[PDB]
Ligand binder design. Structure first.
Ligand SMILES: [Mg+2]
Ligand SMILES: [Mg+2]
Ligand code: NA
Ligand code: NA
Ligand SMILES: [Zn+2]
Ligand SMILES: [Zn+2]
Ligand SMILES: [Zn+2]
Lengths: 412, 424
């Protein structure tokens, strides 16, 4: 018997026997509401995971016993467990880099003073600031060789999803990791993973959505079976570039550390798929409801699952941070976002495809879109993040509200 | 506010008020037994939950709430409508030859619709092309070439390349295993309890998923591919490495000259078939076994049957849960076949495991359990495999399609007892 069917059947008999005055009637009303909500709020996969997890632990018990029997009983248990169970200019650059630890550092100026290499410049600054090159025994040459190839694999002719956007997300993730409420929560390995996930999260982006890649029967959609097409590709390129000569920035980690980092990075870059937004928000919201905070204001994250839920939300929030930056920065990101949408619209036109809603200058409502994006996606996410790390993130939330009102006032 | 927490708090309130509200010996016994039952139900509700099951309830609620807002916004202006379309699409998730071998082939193919077909003989009488031979027989039997306007040339061009992309030098995961799974799926689709339940497109999808489910298999596990830092593991981010690859090859082969067997389907039919096939082949990942078992078990518990009484599967979700379990059961059908067939499959799976062990030895890796040809406990493994995986799955399938599959279950038990009796 499946666990959810068992619980519902016993809750139905409790209700049937409860029926067998104001207090009695008001409670039957509350029971009937909760029992109905229990059923309706369930999906096919939520019901499934309760049952599969139960079945997995039932088999895990039966094999632990079998393992104790003989050397044969042990290899049979190992086979079954592994198969059927789961798991000059440099002066100007130095001046800009003084804002490294600040929200809204001008990354556009960093690009201008680094010969249009903001990703290499910002990643090297972050790694030195955080002492990651010493901690993880990364030679400067290894770091710069990797970063330069990584930057080279970001498309220059794509207006938004280029190395300047990656530099911005990596820098924003670096600032978010420094949140006082999150002091001493993450290991050096988790910090390394988050900044690296942020730097590679859009590498080799063609400047077109996953839906465009699916609809055009692209090699990428074919290879990845229409699931997180781009996000899977960003990871494959990111990890492949480590195999280039003198570029293995993870060469001096232990085998266990590389296994752990790889798992965390995959997890974080897959969470940047925009269609997974509501799942991340639901995870972040449950974390806020059950949050355990210190007297000094520091968050308590006991286990790996809690830490990765926060980290995957951090990289996603960093990816959706343009509306939280000063208006001057935000307006420049919106121009780039729009330019890239229009560029996808051009590719749709050359293919005879139906032009996407925001993909055409004649019909795109730029200001209303920014207001919708903030109201429906950016503000609910950042408000949940701000609740988790209170009072840190209030300035972020204040900047967001100003920018929202500015865009609202700019609607024609 | 997350919904599960809200429900939990509500049921906790009901319980704390039930205690206030509670000859009369029978009343007290009823009052106490129901409180203990409620407490057990509440404890089990919390414990039986996971991080992903709870969050799933919340994300689905958030998705529905936003969809409601966006539907209203789309009615406001042409601008509101394109803003709602942007947000919805981005942030939400939705001739023939006369030969002795040909006469022998026609004789074997008389058992096409039977669980008792010998695929080893089909391979021998078809120039070691069991996949093309069996798929062509299935497609003609079911009239799929006429229904979906597939010319024989296109069909045979595709099937031949598909068969060519199965490795000959791999003992188990070759075209003979694919032919076996496709034929077993064809038989399972014909179960009387599942009569007129599936559309022609769903039938096409299941047989196609079964035929392509192991294409280009290197004869090594996903764990071997992850541990050796293979290109495949790198490409697929260590998740269902092989299963993703089987699908990519299977769909890529349609692009070969005059091999597009889906060329005359509508765009909507190709979209639906593609979705179903991906779903079915990803479900063949053995590490997903307990999820499929869980889904099949819930389906048995809530099963509705007509006057006939043929199974009733109202929506698509129910239909795909059965179909992915069917292809998985077909993939785990070797122990349910006659002993003569089963013993030949066991030799092949062992030979493949040992070939992997040789690769681990040459690489200086620790030899995987079952991969050492010198230490493998072949019989005990077959007993464990049946007791823990094959029998629980087939027993659940038999409950769903009762009384059909009783013979499948009887054989499984005989083969298990035979292997048990053969333990040295
Ligand atoms: Mg992205
Ligand atoms: Mg397989
Ligand atoms: Na470039
Ligand atoms: Na071959
Ligand atoms: Zn060098
Ligand atoms: Zn991004
Ligand atoms: Zn198979």
């Amino acid at each position: 018997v499946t666990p959810f069917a068992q619980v519902l059947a016993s809750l139905r008999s409790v209700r049937n026997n409860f029926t067998i005055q104001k207090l009695a009637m008001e409670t039957l009303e509350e029971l009937d509401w909760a029992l109905d909500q229990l059923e309706t709020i369930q999906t096919y996969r939520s019901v499934s995971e309760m049952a599969s997890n139960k079945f997995k632990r039932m088999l895990n018990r039966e094999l632990t016993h079998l393992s104790e029997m003989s050397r044969c009983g042990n290899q049979v248990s190992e086979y079954i467990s592994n198969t059927f169970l789961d798991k000059e200019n440099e002066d100007h650059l130095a001046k800009e880099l003084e804002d490294l630890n600040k929200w809204g550092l001008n990354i556009f100026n960093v690009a201008g003073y680094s010969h249009n290499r903001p990703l290499t410049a910002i990643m090297y600054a972050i790694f030195q600031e955080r002492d990651l090159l010493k901690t993880f025994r990364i030679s400067s040459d290894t770091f710069i060789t990797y970063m330069m190839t990584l930057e080279d694999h970001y498309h220059s002719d794509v207006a938004y999803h280029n190395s300047l956007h990656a530099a911005d997300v990596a820098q924003s993730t670096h600032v978010l990791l420094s949140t006082p409420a999150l002091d001493a929560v993450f290991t050096d390995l988790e910090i390394l993973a988050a900044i690296f996930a942020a730097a590679i999260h859009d590498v080799d982006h063609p400047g077109v959505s996953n839906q465009f890649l699916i609809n055009t029967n692209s090699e990428l959609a074919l290879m990845y079976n229409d699931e997180s097409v781009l996000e899977n590709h960003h990871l494959a390129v990111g990890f492949k570039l480590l195999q280039e000569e003198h570029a293995d920035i993870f060469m001096n980690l232990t085998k266990k550390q590389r296994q752990t980092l790889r798992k965390m990075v995959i997890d974080m870059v897959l969470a940047t798929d925009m269609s997974k937004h509501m799942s991340l928000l639901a995870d972040l919201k449950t974390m806020v409801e059950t949050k355990k905070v210190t007297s000094s204001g520091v968050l308590l994250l006991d286990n790996y699952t809690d830490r990765i839920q926060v980290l995957r939300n951090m990289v996603h929030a960093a990816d959706l941070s343009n509306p939280t930056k000063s208006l001057e920065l935000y307006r420049q990101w919106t121009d780039r976002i729009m330019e890239e949408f229009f560029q996808q619209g051009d590719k749709e036109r050359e293919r005879g495809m139906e032009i996407s809603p925001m993909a055409d200058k004649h019909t795109a409502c730029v200001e209303k879109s920014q207001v919708g994006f903030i109201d429906y996606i950016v503000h609910p996410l950042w408000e949940t993040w701000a609740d988790l790390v209170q009072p840190d993130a209030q300035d972020i939330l204040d900047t967001l509200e100003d920018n929202r009102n500015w865009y609202q006032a700019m609607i024609p």
